[PDB]
Design a protein around this nucleic acid. Structure first.
Ligand SMILES: Cc1cn([C@H]2C[C@H](O)[C@@H](COP(=O)(O)O)O2)c(=O)[nH]c1=O
Ligand SMILES: Cc1cn([C@H]2C[C@H](O)[C@@H](COP(=O)(O)O)O2)c(=O)[nH]c1=O
Lengths: 319, 319
DNA sequence: TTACAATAACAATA
DNA sequence: TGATATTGTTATTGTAA
DNA sequence: TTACAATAACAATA
DNA sequence: TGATATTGTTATTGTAA
């Protein structure tokens, strides 16, 4: 197995950081680069274990959550420099107890949400705003609108989504499009990786598609296209965050602040409300439209966040 | 740690089998008894490993599912004879691959059900039959009726359920009772073990309660009360199975045969349809009424089996 | 002696 | 069933001034 | 040379 | 996150006959 290599992306990041004139020092990326370098020429498992142990020692005061993320960064770096068969991958791991606890925390949060759904009282207004965004000349605005209307993830919409018209007999679907470019997935059976699949839309599909090509043909849309996730975050995350804060500050439910992924939650809640066939559970429908693996009903649980006021009324009406 | 002991329940079962005049020979219980006996005086892990390995060798041609169950029987026997701290418990285990595969199979089945819910067209009739059973003089019939009306498990209803009236301000709830005696659970936080908790009922609570005391005061109801699960199965399972087959043969959906647990599925579907408050998900509501652990939304997935025809209609009515 | 924008760390969610 | 890829939030850095 | 009831094995589900 | 407790189905046994 390779006893030498470099994590190219990390060092490119550091080298780009060499010319900043503002901002935090890239301490973490640095530690990761040093780590990978020190690893060069290492052959003994106890040496590897020692090195990792020092790294884990440094991460001490961080949040459990932060530590899991960081561990992912180191593991991806090792994997990039030395490949998949490097014994350090058996060693640079988190404790099972830590992963287990993260899971417990998460499921508890979700359970808490399921017993106290937030009533999205002004959701029609939110969707209206998103429809209006589809006509803006600012491609960020169009992007947001497309989030609301298609429920695609921001990274998907801005960097890789392929929206297409969807058939319906001999005609074209008014309320559904074809989508390719599912993120957070990898090649496999039952996976939507590189799969084109049909998704409902919350305004006319023509409108959506037109707004999309306008996004893709713009200047900023040309930068965005095919970008990596790190690049995407750096270029757009804070601006998108702020714009969304502002756009929905008045209409969003009081229980939470307006965030981009909010739109993906609402979308699922709205599409189910409007389009769900009768022989299918809410879990199944959500998993279907959100691009989840074939037999995964559990990720859908994360998205049951809101109650639409019509349903709140109707349920209250008994008795 | 104890190097000696006996699995009393197993040998009592064998000794009761000594006087049968009909039926299969208790091969399995026998092998388990011999196993436990051979274990007496054992001190060396390789000897233990060998013994287990022979047992696992015998179980070869059985179904994965059967093998997991059998392994539970051996483990419970070891645990009963020698206690919880016996090193054989580290050895008499199934493979991780086997448990993982069982899980995959299960989730796939559930996923398949969620994308093809069975329309329970005649469910009003089924519930009616169950209401009628509450007036029968045959306590089995009453029991069935109470399954349909309370969604409690058969073992719970026949052997240990404690039904009680539920308050509602200064009055008494018309559509909910108090229940104690949750099975398939053990002492813990967030658990319903020995907890009295409120559950909806699908006919008037008075009716339900009256039918219950009639069940409890009967002769067969006196046998049933406080019985073990093995005793319960042996005494009642095949008769209950047959009676249920017969009672619902004409009205049950064509996609499946009428089984007692069917009534627990339908119950949950009906109660949600009628009683579910607006700020709660179907998963949460099911987990609440079915007695599931506090942060467990996943077991609820097993119960989404049917679509009530009203919902099928209403969903079909768009567009 | 503060503003401010820019950056990556830190952190949560799916 | 081993341990990721997105989204979301804040402390630090450098610079005008 | 079969019926039949009884039993526990075998098996799936939650 | 280690490995159970219920519910559901069928093959074997013994007995009349
Ligand atoms: C823990 C966890 C893992 N995963 C995936 C990412 C990897 O495939 C693997 C890592 O754990 O599981 C999720 O998608 N969500 C989660 O909450
Ligand atoms: C695999 C599995 C386990 N369990 C419980 C029983 C034990 O507490 C433990 C055994 O695995 O998990 C279930 O309730 N359902 C399942 O499907």
């Amino acid at each position: 197995y390779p006893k030498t290599g470099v994590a190219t992306s990390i060092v490119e990041k550091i080298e780009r950081a060499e010319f900043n004139t503002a901002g935090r020092k890239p301490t973490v990326l640095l530690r990761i680069a040093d780590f990978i370098a020190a690893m060069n020429g290492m052959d003994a498992k106890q040496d590897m274990q020692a090195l990792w142990d020092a790294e884990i020692a440094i991460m001490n005061g961080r949040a459990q959550t932060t530590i899991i993320s960081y561990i992912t960064k180191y593991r991806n770096a090792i994997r990039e420099a030395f490949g998949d068969d490097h014994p350090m991958l058996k060693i640079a791991t988190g404790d099972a107890a830590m992963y287990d606890e993260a899971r417990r925390v998460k499921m508890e949060k979700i359970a808490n949400k399921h017993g106290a759904l937030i009533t999205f009282e002004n959701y029609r207004q939110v969707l209206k705003i998103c429809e209006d965004c589809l006509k803006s000349s600012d491609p960020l605005m169009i992007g947001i609108g497309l989030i609301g209307m298609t429920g695609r993830r921001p990274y998907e919409v801005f960097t890789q989504a392929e929206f297409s018209p969807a058939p319906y007999g001999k005609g074209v679907s008014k309320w559904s499009i074809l989508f390719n470019g599912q993120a957070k997935t990898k090649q496999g059976e039952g996976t939507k990786f590189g799969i084109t699949y049909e998704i409902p839309v919350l305004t006319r599909s023509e409108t959506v598609l037109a707004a999309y090509k306008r996004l893709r043909e713009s200047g900023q849309g040309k930068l965005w296209h095919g970008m990596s996730i790190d690049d995407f975050s750096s270029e757009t995350r804070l601006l998108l965050r702020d714009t969304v804060f502002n756009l929905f500050e008045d209409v969003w439910p009081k229980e939470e602040l307006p965030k981009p992924y909010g739109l993906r939650h609402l979308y699922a809640e709205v599409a189910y409300h409007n389009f769900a066939p009768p022989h299918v559970t809410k879990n199944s429908y959500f998993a279907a439209i959100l691009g989840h693996n074939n037999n995964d009903l559990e990720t859908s649980l994360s998205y049951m966040t809101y109650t639409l006021p019509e349903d709140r009324d109707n349920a209250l009406a008994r008795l």
